[PDB]
Amino acid sequence: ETEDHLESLICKVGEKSACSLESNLEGLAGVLEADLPNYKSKILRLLCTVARLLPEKLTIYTTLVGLLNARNYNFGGEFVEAMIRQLKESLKANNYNEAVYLVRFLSDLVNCHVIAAPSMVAMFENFVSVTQEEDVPQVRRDWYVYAFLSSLPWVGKELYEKKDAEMDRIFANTESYLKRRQKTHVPMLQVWTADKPHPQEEYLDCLWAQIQKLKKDRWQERHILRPYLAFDSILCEALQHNLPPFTPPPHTEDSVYPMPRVIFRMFDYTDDPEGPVMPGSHSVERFVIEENLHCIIKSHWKERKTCAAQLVSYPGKNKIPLNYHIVEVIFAELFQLPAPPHIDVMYTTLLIELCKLQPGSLPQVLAQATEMLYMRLDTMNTTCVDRFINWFSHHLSNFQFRWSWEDWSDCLSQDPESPKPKFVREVLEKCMRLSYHQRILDIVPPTFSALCPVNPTCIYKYGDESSNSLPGHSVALCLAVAFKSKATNDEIFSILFNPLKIEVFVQTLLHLAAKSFSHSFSALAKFHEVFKTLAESDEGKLHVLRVMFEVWRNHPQMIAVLVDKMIRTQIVDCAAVANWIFSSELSRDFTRLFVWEILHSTIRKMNKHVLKIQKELEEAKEKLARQHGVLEEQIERLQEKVESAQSEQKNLFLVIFQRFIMILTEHLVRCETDGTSVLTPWYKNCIERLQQIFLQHHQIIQQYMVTLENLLFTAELDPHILAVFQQFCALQAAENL
Amino acid sequence: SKYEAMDFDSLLKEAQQSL
Amino acid sequence: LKALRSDSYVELSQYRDQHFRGDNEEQEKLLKKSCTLYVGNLSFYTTEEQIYELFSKSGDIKKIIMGLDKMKKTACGFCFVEYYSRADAENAMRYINGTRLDDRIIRTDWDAGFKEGRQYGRGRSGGQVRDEYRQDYDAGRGGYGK
Ligand SMILES: C[n+]1cn([C@@H]2O[C@H](COP(=O)(O)OP(=O)(O)OP(=O)(O)OC[C@H]3O[C@@H](n4cnc5c(N)ncnc54)[C@H](O)[C@@H]3O)[C@@H](O)[C@H]2O)c2nc(N)[nH]c(=O)c21
Ligand SMILES: [Mg+2]
Numbered sequence: 001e002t003e004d005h006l007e008s009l010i011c012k013v014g015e016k017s018a019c020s021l022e023s024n025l026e027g028l029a030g031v032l033e034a035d036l037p038n039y040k041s042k043i044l045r046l047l048c049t050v051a052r053l054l055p056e057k058l059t060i061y062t063t064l065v066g067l068l069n070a071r072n073y074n075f076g077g078e079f080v081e082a083m084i085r086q087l088k089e090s091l092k093a094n095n096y097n098e099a100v101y102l103v104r105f106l107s108d109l110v111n112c113h114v115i116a117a118p119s120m121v122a123m124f125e126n127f128v129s130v131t132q133e134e135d136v137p138q139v140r141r142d143w144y145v146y147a148f149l150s151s152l153p154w155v156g157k158e159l160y161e162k163k164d165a166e167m168d169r170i171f172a173n174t175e176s177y178l179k180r181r182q183k184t185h186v187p188m189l190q191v192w193t194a195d196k197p198h199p200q201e202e203y204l205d206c207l208w209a210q211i212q213k214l215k216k217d218r219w220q221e222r223h224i225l226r227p228y229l230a231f232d233s234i235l236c237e238a239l240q241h242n243l244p245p246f247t248p249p250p251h252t253e254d255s256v257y258p259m260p261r262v263i264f265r266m267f268d269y270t271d272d273p274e275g276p277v278m279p280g281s282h283s284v285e286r287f288v289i290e291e292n293l294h295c296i297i298k299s300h301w302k303e304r305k306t307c308a309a310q311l312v313s314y315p316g317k318n319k320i321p322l323n324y325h326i327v328e329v330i331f332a333e334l335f336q337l338p339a340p341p342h343i344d345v346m347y348t349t350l351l352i353e354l355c356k357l358q359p360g361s362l363p364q365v366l367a368q369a370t371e372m373l374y375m376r377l378d379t380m381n382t383t384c385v386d387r388f389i390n391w392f393s394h395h396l397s398n399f400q401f402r403w404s405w406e407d408w409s410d411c412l413s414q415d416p417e418s419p420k421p422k423f424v425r426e427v428l429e430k431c432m433r434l435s436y437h438q439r440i441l442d443i444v445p446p447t448f449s450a451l452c453p454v455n456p457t458c459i460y461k462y463g464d465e466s467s468n469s470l471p472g473h474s475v476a477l478c479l480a481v482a483f484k485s486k487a488t489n490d491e492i493f494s495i496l497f498n499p500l501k502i503e504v505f506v507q508t509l510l511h512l513a514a515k516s517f518s519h520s521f522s523a524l525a526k527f528h529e530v531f532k533t534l535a536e537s538d539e540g541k542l543h544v545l546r547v548m549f550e551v552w553r554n555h556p557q558m559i560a561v562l563v564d565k566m567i568r569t570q571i572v573d574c575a576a577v578a579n580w581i582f583s584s585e586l587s588r589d590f591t592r593l594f595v596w597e598i599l600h601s602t603i604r605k606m607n608k609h610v611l612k613i614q615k616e617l618e619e620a621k622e623k624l625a626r627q628h629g630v631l632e633e634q635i636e637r638l639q640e641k642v643e644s645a646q647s648e649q650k651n652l653f654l655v656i657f658q659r660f661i662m663i664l665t666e667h668l669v670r671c672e673t674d675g676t677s678v679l680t681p682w683y684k685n686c687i688e689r690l691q692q693i694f695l696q697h698h699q700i701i702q703q704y705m706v707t708l709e710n711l712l713f714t715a716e717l718d719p720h721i722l723a724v725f726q727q728f729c730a731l732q733a734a735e736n737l
Numbered sequence: 738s739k740y741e742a743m744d745f746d747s748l749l750k751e752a753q754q755s756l
Numbered sequence: 757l758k759a760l761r762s763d764s765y766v767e768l769s770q771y772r773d774q775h776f777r778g779d780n781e782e783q784e785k786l787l788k789k790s791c792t793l794y795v796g797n798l799s800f801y802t803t804e805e806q807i808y809e810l811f812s813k814s815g816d817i818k819k820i821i822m823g824l825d826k827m828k829k830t831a832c833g834f835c836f837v838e839y840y841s842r843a844d845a846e847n848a849m850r851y852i853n854g855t856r857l858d859d860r861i862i863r864t865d866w867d868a869g870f871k872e873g874r875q876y877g878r879g880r881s882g883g884q885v886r887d888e889y890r891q892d893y894d895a896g897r898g899g900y901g902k
Contacts, residue, residue, distance in 0.1 A: 004740045009752060011757055012745040019746060031752045053760055302763050302850060345813040349851045394813070398856045433809040435858070516804050518820070557805060564816075741758055 003042050006035060010046050014060040016313060022230045025060070029067035036072065044075075048082050052090075055101040056295040058108060059154070063228040066112025070238035076114050080106075080241045091249045094256040096143050103147045106243070107155035112228050116240035117162040120155065123246040124148045125170050130248055131177040138181065139257040139735045142204060144248065145174060149207050150291075153284045156211070157219035178208055184730030188695055189262040189337045194379040198268070198281070203261040210284045223285040225317045260734055264332035266372055267324050272365075276319040289320060293329040294341075297350075301342045308353040323358060323365045327351075331369065334391060335384040338695050344387060348394045374408060377419040382688040383695060386593060389423065393430030401431055401443045412447060417591065417681040421451060426593045429453045433557050456555035460511040462504070472504040479508040489529045497537045505530065506547040514551075517561055524565060531571040541576035546585055556594035563598050567605060574652050577602045582659035591685040599656070600696060606652055607700060610645050617642050650704060653693075657712050660690045661721060668718045678720065687724060694728040702732050765850040769865050775878075776868055786868040791818070791845045792838045794865040796886075798823075799858040799896030800831045810857055811837050815844020823875050827882035833897060834877075834884065836870050860896060 013028050014021055032043055050061050069076030083106055090099040106123075109115045130136070130144040148170070152159075160167050183202055187193060190200040201209075214221055228235060269278040279285035293311060300307035311326050333340050334347045355363050373380070373388055380388070396403060411420035428451055432440045437455050444452060460466075462476035478495050487495075496505065509527065513519040524531065535544050544566070552558045566572045580586065581599050589595055617638040624631045664686060671678050694701060701708070713725035740748065768787050776783050795807065804820055811817055816839065823834040839845040845866075853864040877884040881902065890901025 005748065005752065007757070008740045008743065009745070009748045011759055012748065015745050017744070017746050019749075024745065024749060027749055027753060031749070034756075049757055053757060299760055303765065304851065306762075306764075343814065343847055343851070345847070345851045349855060352855070390813075400859060434806060436803070436806070517808065518804060518822075557809065561808065738758075 002035070003039065006032075006039060006043060007046055010050060010064075011054075013064070014057055014315075021060070021225075021227055025064055025067065025227055026231070029064055029071075032064075032068060033071060036068075036075065040075065040078075044078060044082060047079060048086060051083065051105045052086060052098060052101060054299065055104065056292045056299070058101075058105060059225050059227060062105060062108040062112050062114075063226075063231065065109065066114055066228050066235055066238070067231060069112070069114045069241075070235050073239050076239075077241050080109070080115060080243065084244065084246075088249065094254070096258055100143075100147050100150060104151045104154065107151035110155050110158050111226065113235045113238040113240060116242055117159050119241075119243035121159055121163050121166055121170070123243055124151075124159075125166065125173075126246050126248065128170050128173045128177070131173060133251070135737065136251045137255075137257060137735045137737065138733075139259060140251055140255065141177065142181075142260065142734075143257050145177060146204060146207065149174070149204070149211050150287075152211050153214065153221060153288055154224060156214060160215075160219060174208075178204060182730065182734070185260060185727060185734055186262060188691060188727045188731055189260060191262070191264055191335045191337070191381050191384050192376055192379045193381075194376070197376075198265040200262045200265060201281075203263050206263045206282075207287065209282045210287050213282050214284045221284050221288075222318050223279070223288055223316055223320070225315060257735065259338075260731075262337070264328070264335060266331065266369070266376075267328050271368065271372075272321040272324050275321045278321050278324060285320075289316075289325050290329050290332070293325060294333070297329070297333065298341065301346060304346070304349050304353050307350055308357050311354065312357055323362050326354065326362070327365050327369050331373075334387055335381075337381065337383060338698065340387075344390065345394070348391050348398075351395065352398060371407065374420065374423065377423055380419065382685065383692050385419070385423065386596075389426045389430060389593065393427050393434065396427075396431060397434040401435065401439070405445050405448055409445075409447065412450065415681060416450070417685075422591075424448070425451045425453075429556070429593075432456075454554045456558070458511060458514045458551050458555065459553070460551070461507045463511075472500045476504045476508050479504060480512065483508065483512050489527060492527065492530055493533070496534075497540050497543075498534065499543055501534050502540060502543050503547050505534070506544060507551060510548065510551045517558070520558070520562060521565055524562075524569060524571065528569060528571070531566075535571060538573075538576065541572040542579060542583070544572060545576060545580040546583070549580075549585060553589070556592075560594060560598050560601070564601060567602060574602045574606050574648070575655055578652055578655045579659070581656075582663060591682055596689055596692070603652065603697060606649050607697065610642075610649050613638070613642055613645050649700070650707075653697075653701060653704060654707070654712070656693060657690075657708070660686075660693075661712060661717065664690070664721055665718060668720065687720065690721075691724050691727070694724065694731075698728065698731060701728070702736065705729075705732070763846075763850070765853060766846050771865055773868060775873075783868050787866045789842065790866055790869055791840070791842050792836055792867045792869050793845055793848060794834065794836055794867045796834050796863045796865070797860055798831075798833045798835065798862060799860055800833050800898055801896060802831070802833075802858045802860075804835075806857060807835060807837065811848055811852060814839075814847035814852055816840050819870075821870055821875050823877065823884075825882040826876040832877045832883055833887070836867060836874070838870065858896065 009028065009031075013024055017024060019027070036043060047061065047065060050057070051065075054061065065076070065079060069079075083102055087099055087102045087106070090096070090102060106115060107120060110117050110120050127144040127148045131141045133141070181204070183205075186202050192198075192200055263281075265281055267278065268281070272278060279289065293314065296310045296314065297307060300310050312322070314322060316322075330347055330351060333342070334344065340347070351366060355366065370392065377385065405424075408420070408424060411418070411424055414421055416422070416425075428440055428444065428448075432453050437453065441449070441452055462470065462473050462480075466473060468474075475495065479492065482491060482495055492505070509523050510520065513523040531544065535541050545563070548562055549559060552562070563572070563577060567574065567577065577598065581595055582590075586595065617635070620631065620635050620638055624635065664683075667680070667683060667686070668678060671680075708725065709729075713722055715722075768784065772780060772783060795811075798807075804822055807820055808817060811820075818838040818840050820838070821836045823832040823836075824830060825832045837845075837848070839848070849864055849866070852862075854861060856862070876882075877887075879885045879888045881888065883898070887897060887901050890897070893900055
């Protein structure tokens with residue numbers, strides 16, 4: 001009972017309240033002394049919970065631990081031993097994002113006089129010592145350097161004045177390592193490839209520049225909240241604890257490190273001239289601010305309303321254009337490559353909640369950011385343009401589809417395939433998918449009708465206007481009657497690789513079920529047997545897709561759901577879809593968005609399929625080994641169907657890369673002959689959609705290295721195509737030798 | 738969850754006055 | 757910590773289906789492992805296509821069942837959405853609930869699962885009971901409320 005009174009009392013310290021933060025900590029520390037005789041065991045694991053799970057409130061809880069230690073030396077030692085215990089647990093379990101929070105906590109405890117600075121310097125020079133380890137991934141060296149550098153904003157001033165002869169040895173080792181790192185992969189992870197207005201810097205190079213500037217600034221940083229400074233008198237007499245010598249858990253093959261990152265930057269101080277001056281990109285204040293806001297989201301992402309309140313109530317020890325930091329952090333996550341920390345739709349609803357809570361400030365910062373993203377689309381990463389499209393359309397659908405389109409009227413004068421007009425076209429198609437065609441024609445200015453989507457109506461080949469001279473017109477009219485007569489399958493068989501039998505069957509079935517998705521899925525299920533018969537040939541599957549497209553080419557949403565349903569019901573397979581995406585009938589729609597949504601949706605189905613059957617094998621293996629014959633015989637049959645699913649996976653990627661290499665090279669010869677530049681807008685999208693394949697599924701494609709290098713991406717290919725493959729090799733190389 | 742839904746001041750001031 | 761594990765959008769609502777076959781205990785059991793959501797406060801003109809586009813943003817949709825008026829057999833202003841996995845329905849519960857569709861705030865609730873007869877409004881006129889006691893005029897909800 002009083003435990004619950006202790007927990008909620010520890011978690012809520014430092015929130016909004018009448019009393020000052022220092023008065024609350026001094027008071028709380030006093031009641032934790034009283035209850036400590038009885039509840040020492042529980043108070044200990046609660047403080048270990050918040051040090052692990054609440055890094056945003058870091059300095060609040062280190063001060064609290066600092067007060068208890070000054071008054072109770074044996075409690076301070078038990079706590080530090082628990083931290084060392086947990087830091088080893090985390091590194092063993094490959095939870096490195098959680099381990100940095102513990103290192104950072106240990107480091108800040110030095111300011112609280114709980115840990116002696118020499119012990120902390122010893123641990124850090126064992127961190128940087130990982131740079132000397134040989135036959136280990138760069139991502140391992142990167143993380144241990146990051147844990148050191150990212151703790152210095154809090155503990156930097158103290159460690160340097162106390163020991164600067166051994167700190168400079170550490171800095172010298174750090175700078176040596178940073179200069180010899182390979183940055184060949186950064187382009188795949190940048191949201192914009194342009195260096196202006198804001199370069200997208202590799203995260204360690206950014207952090208390094210930030211720490212060195214803090215060093216030249218005499219380790220004076222004006223953002224971190226340091227409550228322990230008011231308790232100097234109490235904390236000067238405290239007895240320090242010495243950390244044991246730290247040994248980094250060795251690198252095994254099961255080790256998983258955080259992959260590299262690029263710092264998202266779209267704001268400087270000129271974007272909010274009236275207001276608190278914005279910390280620069282190379283200031284550690286910018287680093288701490290964003291790190292904390294990212295952590296607030298990580299803690300409260302599941303509750304949108306709470307998450308927004310915690311972002312708005314974020315305390316600093318100096319004022320900052322907070323609305324600009326929030327928007328930038330939220331877009332930094334939505335555009336993070338390869339994938340955002342959380343599901344994408346969360347960021348749309350989090351921004352609405354923020355608008356509700358700051359209706360006079362945030363909505364116009366958000367709108368200012370939307371204009372900026374639009375104006376920088378030229379070099380925006382295609383994976384990020386897609387997320388920008390999906391967010392903006394979903395955002396607008398929650399705000400009456402109201403937008404100042406006139407501000408973007410200058411895209412009407414450009415090539416329709418340029419980034420801005422293509423962005424607007426995709427946005428309006430997404431808005432239609434959330435509303436309906438006529439609504440979108442009414443809300444856009446009359447000058448934007450060229451970017452509006454075609455009306456989504458099916459095209460029936462054997463309709464009234466059709467000529468009786470068309471092949472199979474007669475049979476098409478027989479099917480049209482039999483379907484409405486509720487005819488069974490065999491009757492349809494008698495009414496009918498033959499392309500025309502597929503053509504008349506599909507044309508008629510889709511036409512008669514066009515009212516909704518429910519009717520189309522019902523039709524496929526009722527006559528499923530028919531599909532499997534005349535579409536068993538691989539070229540038959542291809543022709544089902546070809547015909548289905550001819551009917552619904554004006555309704556991209558219907559095409560995606562039908563392709564999805566036919567895969568799940570085994571009418572077509574993933575290889576048929578892959579070959580369909582690159583067929584000539586889709587060449588005009590190739591650059592459009594819905595095509596790549598379909599392809600990626602098909603890949604995700606394959607990938608999810610392999611994982612399911614791998615877990616079966618990775619369960620039966622557990623039963624045999626954990627329990628301990630007949631089980632080994634069942635394992636032999638699982639492994640056989642793990643291999644068969646893994647080879648269809650590999651074939652799906654090899655088809656995609658083949659067709660990609662083919663359409664790209666033949667475009668490169670067509671440009672060489674005609675004697676013209678290679679960079680077509682079409683070319684930009686194509687080459688970037690190739691890079692998207694490597695980037696989205698880099699963990700699976702890693703298995704195909706030798707095949708890809710030796711059979712597909714070879715010296716003979718144009719240097720423009722190899723450039724993409726070598727970026728992908730640089731990426732996987734950073735995390736694997 | 739009786740404690741869980743309270744204000745921090747309410748909890749801190751209840752702990753040190755009561756016991 | 758209790759605060760960090762908190763999922764206040766995923767918890768069950770006070771609504772319970774009276775036509776459900778069983779007692780409260782086993783209905784609550786079905787709710788906590790259900791992948792199906794009840795979607796309320798829809799415009800009578802909202803189509804299956806619009807619901808697919810919105811609700812797909814949290815995961816893959818297995819089936820959608822539009823609610824109908826038992827007599828007229830027309831859109832009744834609600835539907836059900838069945839996902840393949842529950843995590844996807846949970847995310848629709850957190851982020852899609854309380855947002856707009858056809859410019860109306862929609863409300864999602866966990867459902868015990870679809871069985872025949874649930875697609876029809878239980879109101880005396882054939883529509884939802886919600887629309888029998890309504891007073892204000894609503895264009896997307898079919899005028900006044902009797
Ligand atoms: C509201 N609702 C309806 N369904 C389902 O939609 C289909 C049609 O059902 P219905 O809407 O036509 O009628 P329902 O079964 O909901 O009856 P209920 O009594 O619960 O409806 C409550 C509403 O009636 C109105 N109402 C009734 N009496 C009063 C009163 N004295 N005063 C004010 N309002 C009243 C109010 O609008 C009140 O909100 C059914 O299958 C039903 O399970 C729901 N399913 C889940 N999982 N969660 C739900 O919340 C839900
Ligand atoms: Mg290979």
